[PDB]
Amino acid sequence: VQIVYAXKLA
Amino acid sequence: VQIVYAXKLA
Amino acid sequence: VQIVYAXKLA
Amino acid sequence: VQIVYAXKLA
């Protein structure tokens, strides 16, 4: 999965 | 802060 | 939902 | 970094 927090875990 | 996980916490 | 990134969006 | 969203990116 794509992660945005601004930072792939997918 | 913007959150992407696919979902503002800012 | 609980968010940990270390920071409730729930 | 540890990620909790409930799912290490570290």
Burial of D5 (0-12, 13-18, 19+ CB in 10 A): middle
User: By C-alpha distance, which of C7, D6, D8 is closest to B3?
Assistant: C7
Provide the number of CB pairs (under 8 Å) joining chain A to chain C.
6
Tokens representing residue D2 in the block: 């540890």
| Cα distance between residue C3 and residue D1, in whole Å | 12
- Which residue(s) pair with D8 in the sheet? D2
Provide the number of CB pairs (under 8 Å) joining chain B to chain D.
6
CA B8 to chain centre: 5
Place of tokens 């999965």: A1
Q: For chain A, what is the radius of gyration of the CA atoms? A: 6
Partners of residue D1 in chain C, C-beta under 8 Å: 5-6
Amino acid in the structure at residue D1: V
Q: Do A10 and A4 touch, CB atoms closer than 8 A?
A: no
Resolution of this structure in Å: 2.0
